[PDB]
């Protein structure tokens, strides 16, 4: 299941191009870099919650929906495992 | 070496239109945008839009009136900006740069000078 | 969209000495402003990103400062090689833009 660890980063680089895909076009939109791109990504999976930075494409909002799906779901698995890796060497 | 090949000058009729170019070299990446900048005489630089090769999407800038339709070529490296029906206000230089899509032109054409005359 | 704000128009310094251009945006972008410099019938080019970044194959005479609103482009001993046009742009928020120009001026 740890190859989840990697369906992620899959995910939040993809989430990351076609977020500036979609975004780029629609005046004001803050999320048109790549970089930015990515830690929109980490951010969104993680569901931190700066709201630093979003999407306001009807498009970008989407690639947002599958970021959040696919990254919540896989990083829910990072984590589940990560939780399981420390109850035993306690 | 030189990254971004433009022809020097293109002549134009009042209604004509011409499609100008820009040709890469160096390193290129999916990720890579290139934009195309007009600059009349005397006054300073104006973005007129942005396309992505490695995908062919482009947005145009909407304050200006759109004269403009960029196309791209992945093969030959080629960017294409078609300019159509222009008058003595669309006649200057105009520069394509190549932008990494993390927001700066590191790169620029040596621009191409465009004159719509009789 | 935003605005980039480069006033005054032209700068008038004497060799050697310091110069600041600035540029002010309509709006808080951080720091993703950047500076080009362009010299008579030249295109433009990269002089410092994202504010302070510096660039390679740039004296170590130019240097960026400042973040939001207010930026300040800045020489250290002006020389005639340094007469041109300065421009700031932002990628902060799309489309990207463009100030309106700043000539340097050295008076001999």
């Known amino acids: 299941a740890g190859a989840a660890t990697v369906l992620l980063v899959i995910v939040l680089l993809a989430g990351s191009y076609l977020a500036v895909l979609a975004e780029r076009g629609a005046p004001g939109a803050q999320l048109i870099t790549y970089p930015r791109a990515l830690w929109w990504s980490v951010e969104t999976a993680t569901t931190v919650g700066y709201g630093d930075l979003y999407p306001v494409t009807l498009w970008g909002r989407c690639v947002a929906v599958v970021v959040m799906v696919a990254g919540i779901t896989s990083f829910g698995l990072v984590t589940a495992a990560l939780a399981t890796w420390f109850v035993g060497q306690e | 070496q030189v990254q971004l090949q433009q022809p020097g000058a293109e002549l134009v009729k009042p209604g004509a239109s011409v499609k100008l170019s820009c040709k890469a070299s160096?390193?290129?990446?999916?990720?890579?945008?290139i934009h195309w900048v007009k600059q009349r005489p005397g006054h300073g630089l104006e973005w007129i839009g942005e396309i992505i090769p490695s995908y062919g999407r482009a947005n145009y800038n909407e304050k200006i009136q759109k004269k403009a339709t960029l196309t791209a070529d992945k093969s030959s490296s080629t960017a294409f900006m078609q300019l159509s029906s222009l008058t003595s206000e669309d006649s200057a230089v105009y520069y394509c740069?190549?932008?990494?899509?993390?927001?700066?032109?590191?790169?620029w054409g040596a621009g191409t000078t465009v004159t719509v005359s009789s | 969209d935003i605005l980039l704000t480069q006033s005054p128009a032209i700068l008038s310094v004497s060799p050697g000495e310091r110069v600041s251009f600035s540029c002010r945006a309509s709006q808080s972008i951080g720091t993703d402003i950047h500076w080009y410099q362009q010299r008579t019938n030249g295109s433009p080019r990269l002089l410092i990103k994202?504010?302070?970044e510096s660039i390679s194959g740039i004296p170590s005479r130019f240097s960026g400062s400042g973040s939001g609103t207010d930026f300040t482009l800045s020489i250290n001993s002006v020389e005639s090689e340094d007469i041109a046009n300065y421009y700031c742009?932002?990628?902060?928020?799309?489309?990207?833009?463009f100030g309106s120009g700043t000539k340097l001026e050295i008076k001999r």
């Open positions: 742009q932002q990628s902060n928020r799309w489309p990207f833009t």
């Open positions: 160096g390193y290129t990446f999916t990720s890579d945008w």
């Open positions: 994202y504010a302070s």
């Open positions: 740069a190549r932008e990494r899509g993390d927001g700066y032109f590191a790169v």
